Amino acid sequence: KGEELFTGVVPILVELDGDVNGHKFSVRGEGEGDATNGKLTLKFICTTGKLPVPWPTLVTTLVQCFSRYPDHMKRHDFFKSAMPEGYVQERTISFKDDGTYKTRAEVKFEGDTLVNRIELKGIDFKEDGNILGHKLEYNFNSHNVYITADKQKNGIKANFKIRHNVEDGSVQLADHYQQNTPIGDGPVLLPDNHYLSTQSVLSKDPNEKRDHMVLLEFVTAAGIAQVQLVESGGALVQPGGSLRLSCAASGFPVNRYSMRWYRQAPGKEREWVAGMSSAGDRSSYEDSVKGRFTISRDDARNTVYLQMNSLKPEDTAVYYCNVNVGFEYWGQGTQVTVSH
Amino acid sequence: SKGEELFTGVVPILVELDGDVNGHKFSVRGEGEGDATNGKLTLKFICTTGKLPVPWPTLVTTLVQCFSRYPDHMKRHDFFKSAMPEGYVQERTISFKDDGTYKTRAEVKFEGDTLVNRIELKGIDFKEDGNILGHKLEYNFNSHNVYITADKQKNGIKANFKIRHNVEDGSVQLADHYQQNTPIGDGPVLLPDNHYLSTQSVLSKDPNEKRDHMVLLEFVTAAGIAQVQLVESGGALVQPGGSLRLSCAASGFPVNRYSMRWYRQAPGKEREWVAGMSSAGDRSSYEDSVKGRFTISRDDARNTVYLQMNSLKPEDTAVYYCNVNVGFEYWGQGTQVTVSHH
């Protein structure tokens, strides 16, 4: 419903009033988000003069509604679902061996503009530490924001550890705890556990003498696979011996699709071994393994098997299971070794 | 860069295929829209000759790699868009294993606002009772990596890949592709280094179309070359109290203009920062676990970074990664060090 708003490039406005250890400041920023590409372009300015904290410490605080949710996960996007009326975003950010940011923001549409308005309160910072002492490199790393649903408050919670590069070669950790709740009474999408993969790049406007930050960001949602295969049963076995592989299938009925086994020996190419028809009325085997190997499936437990008999050293490989439901899927594989 | 600009928006596609396989003749026509920025394709094809003598999946690779998504760092490596608007000739030999062969020749150029793929296809030596002419192939398509090399003589590229066709009896029908592209104009073009296209396709049908047809959704994105890369070495099995030295080879940036760090991940634990040194090289830092035992350094000449590990304990067992941020964070694949008795 709210997703329709993010189809195009949307003008962004960011407004932050901070206080850290009594040091007060204001940040203002403008740009355009594109959810369609999961892209952000913004320029921020300290309007109060010089910024008392490093710019990277403000990055996570300064619009996750611009994240790119792939089609399959679009049901899991809380952020766009709460718009235009928006959501409240609250964080407690703990810098290790140093002070803490506490933040409260409202991200809503005002006119055609999406507005992030934040109040930020820092405390317990060491004046000689990495933040107030400006010891952090100007850049930003890539992180995964782990999202769970908050059903009690009709919103989400998030947990992630931000890694800030320190100029002496060390790292400054910022523990993020996040909770969002929508502004309106309108119903919202509450997702299952997933994560946002975020990468940012920081820079400066060559012509700008005010204390500022130019920010490009890419966020894309992930962490749920519609289909999953897990192989099991691999082991080390003497020549002439026998073992059985099992694959646990998820995301689809095993009896509505054909399933195949592949194997890859070291240095050689991955080859098809065995397979069976979706109906289960036909099964096929590659020439190397014919008569030795047998494929089968259990419709009830949604699992597929490969029985391997009269094993030879040449059968040594990593064995994979394979299915195509609109898309091809593989398992992580399982290692069988035949020696001597 | 002239030719990239043609692909900035969603552009209409038209495909027209004329073919003969074992004397059986047919024509295919298709249309839709490509988006190169996301590398997405949406097309609908129709056999205009009546019923198609071959399975639709066998025509997929023949039926516009200029719509592949080449990421910013690899944009110098995009031959396909560089040949536009004049376009390129794409030629393939497709050998179906234990069966016949396709020969294809295509011209992909812009005509008006629509990018047009026009193909001649000649099949021969096909078994009338085989998987192709006997229609034994499932209606679907798998995911493949298309390996692209430059062919410098022809001012263009070559490709080699194996398409895997699912057969209805549970088996697989292999189609070996041999590909060569050459530009239509003499205008200079981008010749890439070795890389690959990661392609996924999905097939479906239009409910209101009674003609023999194929509805195709495709996702292609280029990969296999990073502007910046870290490769660790030196991981091994080591006795407690022993020593080993890890090295990381860096590419795409001077090791002396950027800070480099080492991280490690023990099994079941979270990845932790171990050691690092300033971009200038005047400061280096170490975590409490490793303090005094570990030493980081770098060789500006060989553009390499080291980690010396002394008085090793079992707890030092982990995969060790090297880390740098040039505009983006980069990791190596890591190297495994194991500390245990013999």
From Swiss-Prot, chain B:
Changing residue 146 to I: In Azurite; shifts the excitation and emission spectra to shorter wavelengths and increases quantum yields compared to BFP. Changing residue 198 to F: In H9; increases fluorescence at 395 nm excitation. Changing residue 189 to A: In mut1.5; shifts fluorescence lifetime from 3.03 to 2.72 ns. Contains a chromophore consisting of modified amino acid residues. Maturation of the chromophore requires nothing other than molecular oxygen. Changing residue 142 to I: In ECFP; leads to cyan fluorescence, folds faster and more efficiently at 37 degrees Celsius and has superior solubility and brightness. Changing residue 75 to R: In Topaz; shifts the major emission and exitation peak up to 20 nm. One of its GO terms (biological process) is generation of precursor metabolites and energy. This is Green fluorescent protein. The lineage of its organism: Eukaryota, Metazoa, Cnidaria, Hydrozoa, Hydroidolina. The gene is GFP.
